[PDB]
Amino acid sequence: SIVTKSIVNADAEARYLSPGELERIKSFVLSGQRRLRIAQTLTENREMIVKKGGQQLFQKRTDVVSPGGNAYGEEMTATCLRDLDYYLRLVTYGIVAGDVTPIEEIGLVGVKEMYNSLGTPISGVSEGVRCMKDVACSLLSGEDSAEAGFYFDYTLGAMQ
Amino acid sequence: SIVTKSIVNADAEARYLSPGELERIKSFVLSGQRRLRIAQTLTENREMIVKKGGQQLFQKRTDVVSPGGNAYGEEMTATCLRDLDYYLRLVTYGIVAGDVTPIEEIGLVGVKEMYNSLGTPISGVSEGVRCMKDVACSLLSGEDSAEAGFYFDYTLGAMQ
Amino acid sequence: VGVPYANDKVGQLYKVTPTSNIVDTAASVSIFSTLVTLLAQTGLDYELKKSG
Amino acid sequence: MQDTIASIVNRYDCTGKYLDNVAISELESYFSTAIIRLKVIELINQSSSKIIQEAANRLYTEQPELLRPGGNSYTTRRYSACLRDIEYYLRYASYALIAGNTTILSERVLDGLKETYSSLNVPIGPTVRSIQLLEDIICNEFIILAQKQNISTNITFIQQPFNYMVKYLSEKNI
Amino acid sequence: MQDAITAVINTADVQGKYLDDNSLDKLRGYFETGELRVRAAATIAANAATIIKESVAKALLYSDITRPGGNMYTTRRYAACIRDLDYYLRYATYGMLAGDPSILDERVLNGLKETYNSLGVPIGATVQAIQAMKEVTASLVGTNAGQEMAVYFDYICSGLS
Amino acid sequence: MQDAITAVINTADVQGKYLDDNSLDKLRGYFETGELRVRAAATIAANAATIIKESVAKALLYSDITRPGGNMYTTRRYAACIRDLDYYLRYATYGMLAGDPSILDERVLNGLKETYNSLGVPIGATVQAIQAMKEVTASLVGTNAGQEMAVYFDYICSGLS
Amino acid sequence: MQDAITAVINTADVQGKYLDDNSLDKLRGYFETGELRVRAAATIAANAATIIKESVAKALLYSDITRPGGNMYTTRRYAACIRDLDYYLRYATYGMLAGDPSILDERVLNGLKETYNSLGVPIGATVQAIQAMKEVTASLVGTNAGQEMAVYFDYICSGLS
Amino acid sequence: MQDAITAVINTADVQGKYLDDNSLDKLRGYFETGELRVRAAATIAANAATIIKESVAKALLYSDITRPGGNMYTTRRYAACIRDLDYYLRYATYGMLAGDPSILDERVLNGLKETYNSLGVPIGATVQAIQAMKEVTASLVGTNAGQEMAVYFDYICSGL
Amino acid sequence: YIHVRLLGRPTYGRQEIDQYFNIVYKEGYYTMIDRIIDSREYTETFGSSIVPYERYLTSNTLISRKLGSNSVHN
Amino acid sequence: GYDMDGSGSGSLNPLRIKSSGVEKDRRAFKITYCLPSESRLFTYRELQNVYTTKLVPFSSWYAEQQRIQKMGGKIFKVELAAGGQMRSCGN
Amino acid sequence: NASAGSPLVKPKLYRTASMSAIMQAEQQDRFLQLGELNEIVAFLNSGSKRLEIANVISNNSNLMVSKAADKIFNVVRYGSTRMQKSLRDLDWFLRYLTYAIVAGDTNILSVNIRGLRELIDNACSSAAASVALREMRKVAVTLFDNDSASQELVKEYFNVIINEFDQSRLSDKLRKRASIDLQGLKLPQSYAMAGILKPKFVMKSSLSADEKNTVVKACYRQVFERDIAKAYNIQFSGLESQVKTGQLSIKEFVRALGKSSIYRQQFHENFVDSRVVELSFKHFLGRGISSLEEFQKYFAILSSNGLYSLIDSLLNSLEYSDYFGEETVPYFRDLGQEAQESKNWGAQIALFNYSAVFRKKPQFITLFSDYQNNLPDQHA
Numbered sequence A, B: 001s002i003v004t005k006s007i008v009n010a011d012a013e014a015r016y017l018s019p020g021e022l023e024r025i026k027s028f029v030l031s032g033q034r035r036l037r038i039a040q041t042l043t044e045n046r047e048m049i050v051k052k053g054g055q056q057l058f059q060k061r062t063d064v065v066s067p068g069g070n071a072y073g074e075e076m077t078a079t080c081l082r083d084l085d086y087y088l089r090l091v092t093y094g095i096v097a098g099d100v101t102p103i104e105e106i107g108l109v110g111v112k113e114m115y116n117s118l119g120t121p122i123s124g125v126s127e128g129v130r131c132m133k134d135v136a137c138s139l140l141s142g143e144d145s146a147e148a149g150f151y152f153d154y155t156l157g158a159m160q
Numbered sequence C: 001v002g003v004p005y006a007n008d009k010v011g012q013l014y015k016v017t018p019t020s021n022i023v024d025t026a027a028s029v030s031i032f033s034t035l036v037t038l039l040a041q042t043g044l045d046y047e048l049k050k051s052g
Numbered sequence D: 001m002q003d004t005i006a007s008i009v010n011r012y013d014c015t016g017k018y019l020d021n022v023a024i025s026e027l028e029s030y031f032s033t034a035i036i037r038l039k040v041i042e043l044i045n046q047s048s049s050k051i052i053q054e055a056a057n058r059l060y061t062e063q064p065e066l067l068r069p070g071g072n073s074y075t076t077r078r079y080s081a082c083l084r085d086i087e088y089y090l091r092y093a094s095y096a097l098i099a100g101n102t103t104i105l106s107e108r109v110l111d112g113l114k115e116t117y118s119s120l121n122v123p124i125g126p127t128v129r130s131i132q133l134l135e136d137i138i139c140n141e142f143i144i145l146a147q148k149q150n151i152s153t154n155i156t157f158i159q160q161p162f163n164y165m166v167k168y169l170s171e172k173n174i
Numbered sequence E, F, G: 001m002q003d004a005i006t007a008v009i010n011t012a013d014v015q016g017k018y019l020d021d022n023s024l025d026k027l028r029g030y031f032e033t034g035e036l037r038v039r040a041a042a043t044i045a046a047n048a049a050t051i052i053k054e055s056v057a058k059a060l061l062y063s064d065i066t067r068p069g070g071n072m073y074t075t076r077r078y079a080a081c082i083r084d085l086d087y088y089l090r091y092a093t094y095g096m097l098a099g100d101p102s103i104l105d106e107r108v109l110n111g112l113k114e115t116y117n118s119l120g121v122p123i124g125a126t127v128q129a130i131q132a133m134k135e136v137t138a139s140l141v142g143t144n145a146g147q148e149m150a151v152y153f154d155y156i157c158s159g160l161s
Numbered sequence H: 001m002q003d004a005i006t007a008v009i010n011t012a013d014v015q016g017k018y019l020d021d022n023s024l025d026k027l028r029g030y031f032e033t034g035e036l037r038v039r040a041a042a043t044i045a046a047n048a049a050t051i052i053k054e055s056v057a058k059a060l061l062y063s064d065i066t067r068p069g070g071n072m073y074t075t076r077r078y079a080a081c082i083r084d085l086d087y088y089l090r091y092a093t094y095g096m097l098a099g100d101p102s103i104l105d106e107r108v109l110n111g112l113k114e115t116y117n118s119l120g121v122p123i124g125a126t127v128q129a130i131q132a133m134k135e136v137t138a139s140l141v142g143t144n145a146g147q148e149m150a151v152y153f154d155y156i157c158s159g160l
Numbered sequence I: 001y002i003h004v005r006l007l008g009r010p011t012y013g014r015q016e017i018d019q020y021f022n023i024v025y026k027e028g029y030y031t032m033i034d035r036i037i038d039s040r041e042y043t044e045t046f047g048s049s050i051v052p053y054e055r056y057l058t059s060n061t062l063i064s065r066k067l068g069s070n071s072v073h074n
Numbered sequence J: 001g002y003d004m005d006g007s008g009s010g011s012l013n014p015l016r017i018k019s020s021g022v023e024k025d026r027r028a029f030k031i032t033y034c035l036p037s038e039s040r041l042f043t044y045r046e047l048q049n050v051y052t053t054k055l056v057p058f059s060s061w062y063a064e065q066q067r068i069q070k071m072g073g074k075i076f077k078v079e080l081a082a083g084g085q086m087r088s089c090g091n
Numbered sequence K: 001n002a003s004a005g006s007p008l009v010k011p012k013l014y015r016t017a018s019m020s021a022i023m024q025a026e027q028q029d030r031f032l033q034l035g036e037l038n039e040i041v042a043f044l045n046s047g048s049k050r051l052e053i054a055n056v057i058s059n060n061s062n063l064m065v066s067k068a069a070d071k072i073f074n075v076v077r078y079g080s081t082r083m084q085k086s087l088r089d090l091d092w093f094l095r096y097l098t099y100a101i102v103a104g105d106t107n108i109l110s111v112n113i114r115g116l117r118e119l120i121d122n123a124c125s126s127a128a129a130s131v132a133l134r135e136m137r138k139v140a141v142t143l144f145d146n147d148s149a150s151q152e153l154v155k156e157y158f159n160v161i162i163n164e165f166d167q168s169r170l171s172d173k174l175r176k177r178a179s180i181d182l183q184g185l186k187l188p189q190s191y192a193m194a195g196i197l198k199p200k201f202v203m204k205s206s207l208s209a210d211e212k213n214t215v216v217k218a219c220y221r222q223v224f225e226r227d228i229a230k231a232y233n234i235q236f237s238g239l240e241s242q243v244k245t246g247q248l249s250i251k252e253f254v255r256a257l258g259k260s261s262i263y264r265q266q267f268h269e270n271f272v273d274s275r276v277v278e279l280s281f282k283h284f285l286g287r288g289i290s291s292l293e294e295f296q297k298y299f300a301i302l303s304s305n306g307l308y309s310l311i312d313s314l315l316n317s318l319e320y321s322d323y324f325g326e327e328t329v330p331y332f333r334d335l336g337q338e339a340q341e342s343k344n345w346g347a348q349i350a351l352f353n354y355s356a357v358f359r360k361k362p363q364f365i366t367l368f369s370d371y372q373n374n375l376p377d378q379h380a
C-alpha cells in the first residue's frame, strides 16, 4: 500500500512521515471512490476478461495449446485460464491498494523460478496478461483504463 | 487357555469377540485331536523321558549328584527326578490347553524364588528340562515335536 | 479345584464388617441391660465406642 | 477469559489509576449494547444446528474437492469431525458475543490451533471459509430480526469475533 | 506489517475470493477516517520535541530517577531515555496512520520487556512516561484523534506491562 | 564431515590400533561400490531439474497446498519450496557419494526441524516430497544405486520426522 | 501403525480406485510369505535370551565399554543395555511380522536418537550390537527369514545412524 | 545429587582405582568442616524468615518493582516473590551442607532462566535479592560459614 | 555466524537472512562473501581502513556478560 | 509437608481441604462407600464396580470422605483399623 | 505468538486382523505366544480366498450397481449432482467391501456407515438405501454361490452392513470438567472407535493369577514408564499382595507406588519442582496440564508441601475418580480416547513418549505463559 510504503520509507530513515509524503496520502484517500469503482467493474466483468483474453492469447500464440505445448488438453487449458484469473485478481488488489505491493508479493517475487520449474514459457504468460490488459481497457474509460492498464503494465514489466 | 485369553481380552476391551478371535477359536477346536495325540504320546511314554532325561542331565552335569551337592543321595535324586516328572506333566497340560498359562501359573510364576529357597541351582533344572526336550523330540514326528518342543522351549526360557 | 476365591459365592476378600460396637451388641441383647445403664451413667459408653 | 469489564479494570490496574470519565463512558457503551447482544445469543441458541448445517452445505458446495478421495472431509468419520469443529467455532464465537472481548477466543480456541490443523493435515483455507460462512448467516438472521423489533441495524459487534478468528488463522502474504 | 487495507486484502487473499461488499465497508470506513489520520500525523510530526519535553517534565523530572542512583542519572542515560520516548511516539504515529497495530508487534514490543529487564530500565516509570505522552498528544490532536493515538499508546503500555 | 574412508580411520584411530583385516574389508567394499556411486552421481547431476519437476508434480501439486491458504500458495513460497527440494537432492547426492551421511547431519538436518516448526512448514508434505524424489531418482539410476539414494533420502526423512 | 495390507488399502483408497491386479499381487506376495514370517517369529520367540546373550558376547563384552569409564560399566547400565537389545529384537519381530516397518517409526525410532544423544549412549556400539543380533538371528531362522529380519534390523540401524 | 563424599567415590570409581591418599585428604577436609556446616545450617534453619524479610527490605521494597506496573505489584506476586527467595535460601543451605553444588544444578538452575524469561521476572532484581540474602546470611552465621554460603549464593547468581 | 564476524551485529530480521540464503543458492559462497563485504553497511561503518569490531550485542549476551542489573559489585 | 502450616483464605495456595494427619502418619480407615458416577451417560465409559472397600490413609481420609459425599456416594461403615487413638505422640 | 512443535500424528483409520493381532502383545509388552501366532496363521492362510472375492467384485462392480440403480429410481427431482451422489455411493459401498475383505474383518464398514442414515435423511428416503443395499447383497450372494465358503464370508460382510445401516448416530461423547477453569470438548463416537481399542486393566480380586499379574504389571508400566521388574528386579511384594486381596484398592496401590522412594529417586531427584509437577500429571492422571491456572494450583501444593502431598492431592481429586475410579489402572489419554484440547496439542504429544522423561526444562509453564506474552527474544 501507499501508507505501508511511506511508513516503511520514513521508518528506514527513522523519521516522521515527511510533508510531501503526507500530501500524497491525502490525495490517495480522496481518490478512493474512483478506485473502488474501477475494482468494482473489473470484479463484476472478470469472466469476459479471462475468457476473451484467453481467446486472444491462444489465437495470437498457437504454440502452447498445440500438441506438444504446455497447455495442451482440457485440464491444462483450464489451468492456464485459472492463472489468468489469478493475475486478474491481483490487479484488482493492486488497484484498491494504490500500489503494486500486493501484486508483487503475492504474484511476482520469484515467478520466474516457478514457471521455469513448471516448464512454462513465461513470455506466453506476459502475452496473456497483455491480452487481459486490452480487454480491460476495452471495458473502461480513457483515464480510468490508463490507470488500471498501467497496473497491468507493471505485471508485464515483471514478467519480461 | 486360548478361550480364556480371548474372552479376557475382549472383556477388558468391553466388546464382543472379534471375527478374528472367533476364527482363532475355530482353528483351535479343529486342531484338537492332533493335540490330544501329542499329549497321549507324552503321557504314555513318561518313564523313558524322565529316566533318560535324568541320565543325560546327571551325565552332562555331575555337580549336583556329587557329594555335597543339592541332589546327593537316593532320596534327593528321587526328588530331582520327581521334579522333572512335574515339568513333563505341566508340558502336557500346556499342550492340551493350547496355551502356556497352565505351565506358567502352576509351574513358573515364582520358581526362581522357590529353588533359591531350596538351594537348588536353577540352571541344572533348565538343563534337565532341555534333556527331556531332546528325548521327547526323539519320541515324536517332525512338526509334532516342533510344537511340543516349543512348549518345552517356553519352560526353558522361563527358567533362564 | 476351582472353588470361588475366599470360600464364598463371589470371590471377594476383605468384605464389610457385619459386627457392631461393644455398646451396640451389649445393648441389643436383653441381658446386659444394667451394664448399658451403668456405662451410660459413668460415661464409659464413650471409651467402648472407640475403635481400639 | 476477561470480558470487557475485566479488560478495562485490568488496564487501570496496570496504570495504578482510578476509574475516570473515559472508563465510565466505555462501560456505559458496553452496558448499552449488552441487551442487543443478548438477543443475538437467543437467536443462535434457537437456530444453532440450522446455522451449522447451512454453513456445512455452503462449505461443501463451494469446495467439492473435500469429498473427493484426495480431500479431507472425505469419509463419514472425517465429515462428522468437520461438523464437530464448526459446532466449536459457533459456540466460542457466541461466548465472545456475550463477553464483548476476544480473549476467550485466544485463550481457549486459537492458541495452538494452527499447530493442530498443521499436525493433522487439516487444510487452513477450508477452515477460514467455514468461519465466514458462519458470519454471513448470523449477520443475515440478525438483519431480518433486527428490522422486526426495529432496532439499531449496526452489526460490527457481531462481525468482530469471527473477523478476529479469520485474522488469526490466516496466512500473511500481504 | 499491514495497514487496514492489507488486513482486508490478506483476508481476501487467503480465502482467495474477489472483493465483496462487506469488505468494502471496511475500506470505506478507513477512507472516511483517512484525512483525520493525516492531520493528526502532521501535527505530531510538527510538535514531537514539545511532546517529549512536556511529557518528561510531567512524568520524570526532579525525582529519584534523575537524582543520582536513579536510572536517568547520567547524561548518557538521560539522552537514551528521551530517545526511547521519541521511539514510542514515532511508532505510535505509524500505528495510528496505518490503522493497524501490527507495526507495534513487529518492531517495538518484540523482546523489549526482556531488554528492559536486562538493562535495568524501570517498567513502571516507562509506562508513566508513555501515559504522559498520551495526555500531551491527545491535547495536541484533539478528542477524536486523541482516541486513536490513545489506543496505540495503550497498546504499547499493555505490551510492556 | 567424513566419508567411509575417514570413518574407518576414525574408528581405527580412536582405538589406537592400526588398520586390521576388517577395516581393509570395509575399504574394499567402498572401493568396489565406488564406480557405481560415480555413475549414479553423474546421472542425478544430469537430470536434477526433471527430478524436482516430476517429484513436485507427483507429491505436491493440485492439492490444498498450492490452493490458497496452503503453505505453497504464494509464488515466493513455491520458489522456496522447490529450492529446498534442490538442497535435499544435492546433499543426498553428496551423502551417496561419500558413503556416509555425516554431511546430512552437519549441514542439512541440524536445526531444520526447528526451522520448519518455526515457519509453519508442514513436515508431512515435505517427507512425501522427498519420497517422491526417492522414487523418481531410483527410476533414473536403477536398482542398486536407487537403494543407495534410498538410504540417504530415508535418512533425511528420518531426520525431519 | 500399518501392515502391508493396510498400506495397500491406503494407496488404493487414497487414489479412490478399487483394488486392481497390482495390489492383489502385493497381497498375494504377503499371503505367500505369511507362514514363513510366523515360524520365524516362533523361533525368535523361543530363543530370545540366547540371541541377546550371544550378541552381547560377540559385540560388547571385554572392551572399553564394560571396563570402567565405559557406558556399560555398572550393573544398572549393563541391565539397561541388554534391556534395550530386548526391545530391538522384539520390535524387529513385530516389524517382520507386519511386513511394514511403520511400527519401528512409531514406537522405537521416535526420540531414540535424542535419548541416546542425551544420555551419552554410544551410537556405534549400539549399531554393532544390533548387527550382532542380525547375524545370530539369521543363523537361527535361516536364509530367507534371515533376509527378512535383516531388513528390519538394518531399518533400526539406519534409524539410529 | 552428590555430596563431597559421593564426588570422591565418583572420581576414584570412574578411574577404577581405590581410594588413595589424595581422596582420603579430601574426605578429611570434609570431615573437618562437618560440624561448622551443621551449626550454620541450624542457624539458617532458625532465622530463614528474618533473612528473607531483611533481604527483601534491603533489595526490593520502595522501588519501581513494588510500585504499580512492577513485577511485584500485587499481593499474589509479592507472595510468589518471597516464596522464590525461600527456595534460594533453602537450596543454598542444602548446597552448603552437602559441600557440592550439584543440587543447585539439578533442582534449581535447570530451566530457571527460561522460566523467568518466559514469565517476565526481572533477572537483575533477582540477583540483587540473592546477594542481599548473602550479606544478611553471612552476618548471621559469621565469617567462615558466611564464606561457605557465599560460594553457593554466588553459584546461583552465576546461574542467572 | 559469518554475518556476526563480518559486520559486527546479528541479523536485524528475517528478510535480511533470506537475501543471504538466496544468494547462497544461485551464486555460491564466494558471492556470499562479496555481498556482505560490498554491502552499504560495511562500506559506511568500516570502509577500507578499519578492522571490524563488535557493534551490537543482544540481550542474552549482556545478561551473560554480567552487565547492567546482573553485576556483582562485592 | 504436614498440611496445616499457613492455612488458606489469603494464603497464596488456592483453597483446599487440609487434613489433621501428622507428616508421614500410619493411620488408615476400613470403609464402605457406594458411589455411582452420575456421569457415565454423557461420557459413555465402562462400568466400574461400585460399593468398594479399602484402607484409606488417615492423613488423606478427610479429603476422600468429602469427595465421596460431593459425588452423591453413600458411606456405610467407617472403622479405624490401622492406628491407635488419642495418642499425643507417635502418630 | 508461541507454540509447541507440530509432530506427525497417524489420525486413526481402522484395524486389520494381523494388525490388532500384533498390537495386543505389543500393548502388554508380551512377545507372541503360540496362540497369537495362530491368529496370523489363520488369517494369513485364508487370504487368497479374499483375493478371489475382491477379484470378482472388482470385475462385476458395474453390474452390481446397475441392478440396484434401476429399482432405486428421476428427471423431476434430483439434479445431476444428486444422481451422481447416489451412484457414487453405490460404487462406494462396493469399494469398502473389497477393502473390508482384503484387509481385516469389518472396521472400515462399521464406523463409516453407522451414523450416516440421518446425514442422508435430509435428502433421501430411509426405504431407498435399504432396498438398494439389499439388491446388491442378493446379486453378490447369488454371484458367489459356487465356492460356498467365500460367499459365507461375503454374506457375513453384507449382513453386517445392513445391520449397521439400521441403527443410529451412536450418540455424542462429551467431556465435562468439574473444575471451572478447564474447557469442555465433545467427540463423535464414530471418531473414537477407529484403531485398536486401548485395554483397561481391572483388578476385582476374584480374578485368577494371570489377571492379577497382568494388572499389576500394567501398573508398573503406567507409573514408571518402563518395566522396573524384569530388569532391575525391583519387587514391592506387599503392595502387590495387599492389592491381590483387594485390601488396597488400585488407587491406593498407585498411591503407595507414588510415595515410594523409587518414584522420587526416579522422577523427583533429577528434576525441578515445575518439571516434577508436569511428570506427576503424566503418571498419575494420564494427561498434560490443561491450563495455566491449574498449574498455578498444583505448583503451590508441590512447592509448599513436597512431593507426597502432591501425589496425595492428585489421587484425592474429584476428576481422578470419574475417569479411573478405584478399579482401573491409570492409562494415557491420547487421540483415540476423549476430545483433545487444541491448547496443549504439541506438548501433550511431547509428553506421551519414553523420551519425555529426559526433558529437563519445563514444557507447559513456558508454553502457557508464552501464550500470554508477546514475541520473545530469540533468532528468527
Ligand SMILES: CCC1=C(C)/C(=C/C2=NC(=C\c3[nH]c(/C=C4\NC(=O)[C@H](C)[C@H]4CC)c(C)c3CCC(=O)O)/C(CCC(=O)O)=C2C)NC1=O
Residues within 6 Å of the ligand: A064, A069, A070, A071, A076, A079, A080, A081, A083, A084, A086, A087, A106, A107, A118, A120, A121, A122, A123, A124, A125, A128, F057, F061, F062, F063, F066, F067, F072, F073, F074, F075, F078
Ligand atoms: C497467486 C500467484 C500464483 C500463481 C500465478 C500460481 C501458479 C501455478 N501454476 C501451476 C500450474 C500451471 N500453470 C500453467 C500455465 C500456463 N501454461 C501455458 O502454456 C501458458 C503460458 C500458461 C497460462 C497462461 C500450466 C500448464 C500448469 C500446469 C503444468 C503441469 O502441471 O504440467 C501450479 C501447479 C499446481 C496448481 O496449480 O495447483 C501453480 C501453483 N500459483 C500461485 O500461487
Ligand SMILES: CCC1=C(C)/C(=C/C2=NC(=C\c3[nH]c(/C=C4\NC(=O)[C@H](C)[C@H]4CC)c(C)c3CCC(=O)O)/C(CCC(=O)O)=C2C)NC1=O
Residues within 6 Å of the ligand: D057, D060, D067, D074, D075, D076, D077, D079, K082, K085, K086, K089, K092, K093, K096, K112, K113, K116, K119, K120, K123, K124, K125, K128, K129, K132
Ligand atoms: C464408503 C464410505 C462413505 C459413504 C458410504 C459415504 C456417504 C455420504 N453420503 C453423503 C451425501 C448424500 N448421500 C445421498 C444418498 C442418497 N440419496 C438418495 O435419494 C438415495 C436414496 C441415497 C443413496 C442410495 C445424497 C443425495 C447426499 C447429498 C446430500 C447433500 O449434501 O446435498 C455424504 C456427504 C458428503 C457429500 O456427498 O456431499 C457422505 C459423506 N461417505 C463415505 O465416506
Ligand SMILES: CCC1=C(C)/C(=C/C2=NC(=C\c3[nH]c(/C=C4\NC(=O)[C@H](C)[C@H]4CC)c(C)c3CCC(=O)O)/C(CCC(=O)O)=C2C)NC1=O
Residues within 6 Å of the ligand: D066, D072, D073, D078, D079, D081, D082, D083, D085, D086, D088, D089, D092, D108, D109, D110, D116, D120, D122, D123, D125, D126, D127, D130, K011, K012, K185, K186, K187, K335, K338, K339, K340, K341, K342, K343
Ligand atoms: C475449542 C477450540 C478447539 C477446536 C476448533 C478443536 C479442533 C480439533 N479438530 C480435530 C480434528 C478435525 N477437524 C476437522 C475439520 C475440518 N475438516 C475439513 O475439511 C474442514 C475445513 C473442517 C471442518 C469445517 C477434521 C477432518 C478433523 C479430523 C481429521 C483427522 O482426524 O484425520 C481434533 C482432533 C481430535 C478430536 O477432535 O477430538 C481437534 C482437537 N479443538 C479445540 O479445542
Ligand SMILES: CCC1=C(C)/C(=C/C2=NC(=C\c3[nH]c(/C=C4\NC(=O)[C@H](C)[C@H]4CC)c(C)c3CCC(=O)O)/C(CCC(=O)O)=C2C)NC1=O
Residues within 6 Å of the ligand: E061, E062, E063, E066, E067, E072, E073, E074, E075, E078
Ligand atoms: C552528572 C551529569 C549530569 C548533568 C550536568 C545533569 C543536568 C540536569 N540539568 C537539569 C536542569 C537545568 N539545568 C539548568 C542549567 C543552566 N541554566 C542556565 O541558563 C545556565 C547556562 C546553566 C547553569 C550553568 C537549568 C535552568 C535547568 C532547569 C530548567 C528547567 O527546568 O526549566 C536537569 C533536570 C532535572 C533535575 O535537575 O533534576 C538535569 C537532569 N544531569 C546529569 O546527570
Ligand SMILES: CCC1=C(C)/C(=C/C2=NC(=C\c3[nH]c(/C=C4\NC(=O)[C@H](C)[C@H]4CC)c(C)c3CCC(=O)O)/C(CCC(=O)O)=C2C)NC1=O
Residues within 6 Å of the ligand: F065, F071, F072, F077, F078, F080, F081, F082, F084, F085, F087, F088, F107, F108, F112, F115, F119, F121, F122, F125, F126, F129, I018, I021
Ligand atoms: C540445506 C540447508 C537449508 C535448508 C534445507 C533450509 C530451509 C528453509 N526453508 C525456509 C522457508 C520455507 N520452506 C518452505 C517449504 C515447503 N513448503 C511447502 O509447502 C512444501 C511442503 C515444503 C518444501 C518441501 C516454504 C514455503 C518456506 C517459506 C516460509 C516463508 O518465509 O514465507 C527457510 C526460511 C528462509 C526463506 O526461505 O525465506 C529456510 C531457512 N535452509 C537451509 O539453510
Ligand SMILES: CCC1=C(C)/C(=C/C2=NC(=C\c3[nH]c(/C=C4\NC(=O)[C@H](C)[C@H]4CC)c(C)c3CCC(=O)O)/C(CCC(=O)O)=C2C)NC1=O
Residues within 6 Å of the ligand: G065, G071, G072, G076, G077, G078, G080, G081, G082, G084, G085, G087, G088, G091, G107, G108, G112, G115, G119, G121, G122, G125, G126, G129, K354
Ligand atoms: C522400545 C522403546 C524404548 C527403548 C528402545 C528405550 C531405551 C532407553 N535406554 C535407556 C538407558 C540406557 N541405555 C543404555 C544402552 C546402551 N549402553 C551401551 O553401552 C550399549 C552400547 C547400549 C545398548 C546397545 C544404557 C547403559 C542406559 C542407561 C543410562 C543410565 O541411566 O544410567 C533409557 C533410560 C531409562 C533407563 O533405562 O534407566 C531408555 C528410556 N526406551 C524405550 O521406551
Ligand SMILES: CCC1=C(C)/C(=C/C2=NC(=C\c3[nH]c(/C=C4\NC(=O)[C@H](C)[C@H]4CC)c(C)c3CCC(=O)O)/C(CCC(=O)O)=C2C)NC1=O
Residues within 6 Å of the ligand: H065, H071, H072, H077, H078, H080, H081, H082, H084, H085, H087, H107, H108, H109, H112, H115, H119, H121, H122, H125, H126, H127, H129, K272, K273, K274, K275, K295, K296, K299, K300, K303, K365
Ligand atoms: C526449585 C526451582 C524452582 C523455582 C525457583 C521456581 C519459580 C517459579 N516462580 C514463579 C512465579 C514468580 N516468581 C516471581 C519472583 C520474583 N519477582 C520479582 O520481582 C523478584 C525479582 C523475584 C523474587 C525474588 C514472581 C513475581 C512470580 C509470579 C509472576 C506472575 O505470575 O505474574 C512460578 C509460577 C507458578 C508458581 O509459582 O506456582 C514458578 C514455577 N519454580 C521452580 O521449580
